[PDB]
Amino acid sequence: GYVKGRFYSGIKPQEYYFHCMAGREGLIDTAVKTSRSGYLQRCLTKQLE
DNA sequence: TTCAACTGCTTTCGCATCCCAACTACTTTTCCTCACACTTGTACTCCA
Secondary structure: OOOOOEOOOEOOHHHHHHHHHHHHHHHHHHOOOOOOOHHHHHHHHHHOO
């Protein structure tokens, strides 16, 4: 998966497929990120009100 | 001096049995159109 191609000249189909793998690894991490810090701040602000 | 159930909490707006009907039947509603049995003379002779 070492892409020697550049976006100016376009990338080959093998290295097009690996670059779609790196494009989905960030989008799946947002998909596991539903509700994280909304209840941490509520617990602090109720005591420290 | 510990095991095991009862325990409230993850966000931030807005999105998002009874009834009905089918078709074919049979029937009622009545009103209209005539016949079927009875009877006295008259006719054709009947017996006097």
